[PDB]
């Protein structure tokens, strides 16, 4: 598409500038163009791709939640009829959000995942696939909702299986994957006990492995462990 004429390295450079300028839509478009060059992504490049799209969808999701809450209030007893506008605008934001999720899932399917052989890349991309199906599940209300949820589950489960075999329990990708799969269990799959068990086991196994780490790696791992602890404190 529109990035086809720009050099891969220039797209990467501009994605980093867009990040500094908090221009996340631009950042995502540059990283999509970089992926579409067809070469595998380095660790830093995968992080740029993820940061860009997580910020774009994160803004859409927050807006969707505001509009969904207004719509839900509109449907309570005693609420004045205000016409179709709230539903229409929530649907507009929802459709945009679904489009971005479909875009990310398309990049993962064509062809990031199939070319990713190292644990660090494959787990990262499968986690991303689980996340974007999870974001689709947050807004799903129809006949494919069960299949969207199962798609998120299946991607997370494959990422978990690889991460347990191939990564240490303190690895930041393994930890962030477990954090997100635990959130999936809690608020998507109606499985709070599974969410709590996963967060606790992940935390405890990471704790036991901290002694192996340098100071910098210790800081990286404990930062994510604290997010697991935050959720356990909220949920128990």
């Amino acid at each position: 598409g529109a990035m086809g004429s720009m050099e891969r390295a220039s797209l990467i450079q501009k994605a980093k500038l867009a990040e500094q300028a908090e221009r996340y839509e631009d950042m995502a478009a540059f990283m999509k163009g970089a992926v579409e060059k067809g070469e595998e992504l380095s660790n830093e490049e995968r992080n740029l791709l993820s940061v860009a799209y997580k910020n774009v969808v994160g803004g859409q999701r927050a807006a969707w939640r505001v509009l969904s809450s207004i719509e839900q209030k509109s449907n309570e007893e005693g609420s004045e009829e205000k016409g179709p506008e709230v539903r229409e605008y929530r649907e507009k934001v929802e459709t945009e959000l679904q489009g971005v999720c479909d875009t990310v899932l398309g990049l993962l399917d064509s062809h990031l995942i199939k070319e990713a052989g190292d644990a660090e890349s494959r787990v990262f991309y499968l986690k991303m696939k689980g996340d974007y199906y999870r974001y689709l599940a947050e807004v799903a209300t129809g006949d494919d909702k069960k299949r969207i949820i199962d798609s998120a589950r299946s991607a997370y489960q494959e990422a978990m299986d690889i991460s347990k075999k191939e990564m240490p329990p303190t690895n930041p990708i393994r930890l962030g994957l477990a954090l997100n799969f635990s959130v999936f269990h809690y608020e998507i799959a109606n499985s709070p006990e599974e969410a709590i068990s996963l967060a606790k086991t992940t935390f405890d196994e990471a704790m036991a492995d901290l002694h192996t780490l340098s100071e910098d790696s210790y800081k990286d791992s404990t930062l994510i462990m604290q997010l697991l602890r935050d959720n356990l404190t909220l949920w128990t």
Binding site: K54, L179, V183, L227, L234
Partner: peptide, 8 residues
């Protein structure tokens, strides 16, 4: 307090 997912 909203639950944490993997974010900066």
């Amino acid at each position: 307090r909203r639950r944490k997912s993997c974010q900066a």
